[model samples]
Target: LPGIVRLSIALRIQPNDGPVFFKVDGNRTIKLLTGSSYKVEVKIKPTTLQVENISIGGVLVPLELKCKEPDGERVVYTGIYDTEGVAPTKSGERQPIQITMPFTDIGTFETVWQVKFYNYHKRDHCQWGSPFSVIEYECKPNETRSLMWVNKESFL
Candidate 1:
């Protein structure tokens, strides 16, 4: 017999986005036991947006991806975001959280920030997209942040 649904998925939560809800993965989604862990990843493809100005917790990142030597010619970059300890925000409390890398496109470019989640899919989960589950992050907090306190150029 098939297992019964115990808990639903809280994929995304925001301030401006109304109400909190769950996405029923159903037969279309995978299930796991409580405390069963998983990873959420997001990758950005190449484009004219070379100057991505990528950063975390507001600290600018040198680069997230590295190209292959002899693969797709100039593979450009290849990296992944490790969203292990990220989550949604509270009313008075804000938290950075989000991921959706097509599971194949750019190899799960994961991050601890709640960047815009997009794909080739025709629908949104939780029945709350756009007007409901809007991309309301003014910016994805680093959640966990550390700075390059000293710069060689600045010191010199």
Candidate 2:
């Protein structure tokens, strides 16, 4: 949550994008090439719920979200969204990422994802809100200038 680059991004778990469905890139000063790789900050609270796996493209593909665990507890999982595995195939396509995180203590709580795509970054966002989609779009030269992301990244 504290180390990954806050790149300009797109939508999440909805239409198109990547295994890491994000609607808009955050950083407005950089343009991320189709495949250029970048770091995304993953902040899941509790620091105890084990993330089983991340699926993409309406569960049609296997886009692996690689996480770098740097300590005893985890609110810091780093991931890259290699486009093909994560982004949608069509401009208007819609899909969701499945996350299986069972409670380690029991009861109800939410994990903060730190992002929201499509409608763009919300005041607050996280993985706790499941059944999200990746909405893909063709960025203009102007739009690309506002994007920033990383390794394994790509687009249409």
Candidate 3:
């Protein structure tokens, strides 16, 4: 019997054009537009078995099982959170907002993953991205622009 094989989370922001996905990984702050509404999407990909239940940000996000070509198959949980006047906390400007999820003893005694949220700032934008991948953004909190943020400069 297999429980959740992997767990991942991301931000689902709806811009004027369409929805964009920005994954929440380790040691990086996900930028969001101030006073904007967005979805916190949590995905659990189980092998042969699934966990009893899961939640995000202390809220029980509704879960739906779906199969797709790209992602194969998994259960997705989504809930709404807003950045409306939400304080930015990535740099201690204010207490940072934390998004956390928990699991059972299948993987560990307790499973936890957290993402930090901060208000959008152009000067600090270049340093934001998926913690362990090449998926970079071009300094816009609500748009899909793939530009890498390096120590000194930007790259395409």
Candidate 4:
């Protein structure tokens, strides 16, 4: 008993899944006929003894978040709904869930600034969430822009 001191520990885990993609063009907005479709994927590993909960603002709602070329920079676009719950499992084991967001916009190019999965949970009267796994990709335009013009005109 001397070695075992009186102590308490609280552990919480939340996991989520979804598909992420992007598109590129001369425009910098998420609108129809201006964005190109790009493939996207995300993966995450959950901590031991933890469950995955996908929610927005403490409520369960569908989400369609994307990184768009906003003003030549990357920004996120959320869809009509966001999903929540445990990841999919294989046969008897659970597998990560995958959600796909189709594109209605068309363009010559598109890029993915970031693809990620978030984990959330509550502890000691407080909430916590963070990007568990993430990946970033760049979309180059067919026609060189001012930024890339330097390399385009270069002899090398």
- Which candidate ranks first by TM-score, i.e. highest? 3
- Give the clash total for candidate 4: 15
* TM-score against native, each model: 0.22, 0.27, 0.44, 0.22
Taking all chains together, the TM-score of candidate 4 against the true structure is: 0.22
* lDDT of model 3 at position 138: 15
Candidate 4: stretches off by over 4 Å: 1-72, 79-96, 107-133, 137-156
Error at 46, model 2, angstroms: 1.1
Model 1: what TM-score? 0.22
Name the regions of candidate 1 deviating beyond 4 angstroms.
1-54, 58-65, 68-75, 92-156
Once superposed on the true structure, which residue ranges of model 3 sit more than 4 Å away at CA? 1-4, 15-27, 47-71, 89-96, 103-156
Residues 12-90 of candidate 1: C-alpha lDDT, one tens digit per residue: 2222223322223211111111111222111222332232323333333333344432433222333322222333222
Give a tens-digit lDDT track for model 2, residues 23-71.
4333211112222233333444444443332322222222233454466
Local distance difference test scores for all models:
0.26, 0.30, 0.42, 0.24
Residue range 29-145, candidate 3, lDDT tens digits: 344555455565555555333343334334444444443225456465556655566544456322333333434333321223334444555414423444332121112212234
- Model 3: how far residue 13 lies from native, Å: 1.6
Q: Stretches of candidate 2 above 4 Å error?
A: 1-38, 58-74, 85-156
Error of 4 at 14 (Å): 9.6
Displacement of residue 143 (Cα, Å) in model 2 is: 40
> Could you give the candidate ranking by TM-score, starting with the highest?
3, 2, 4, 1
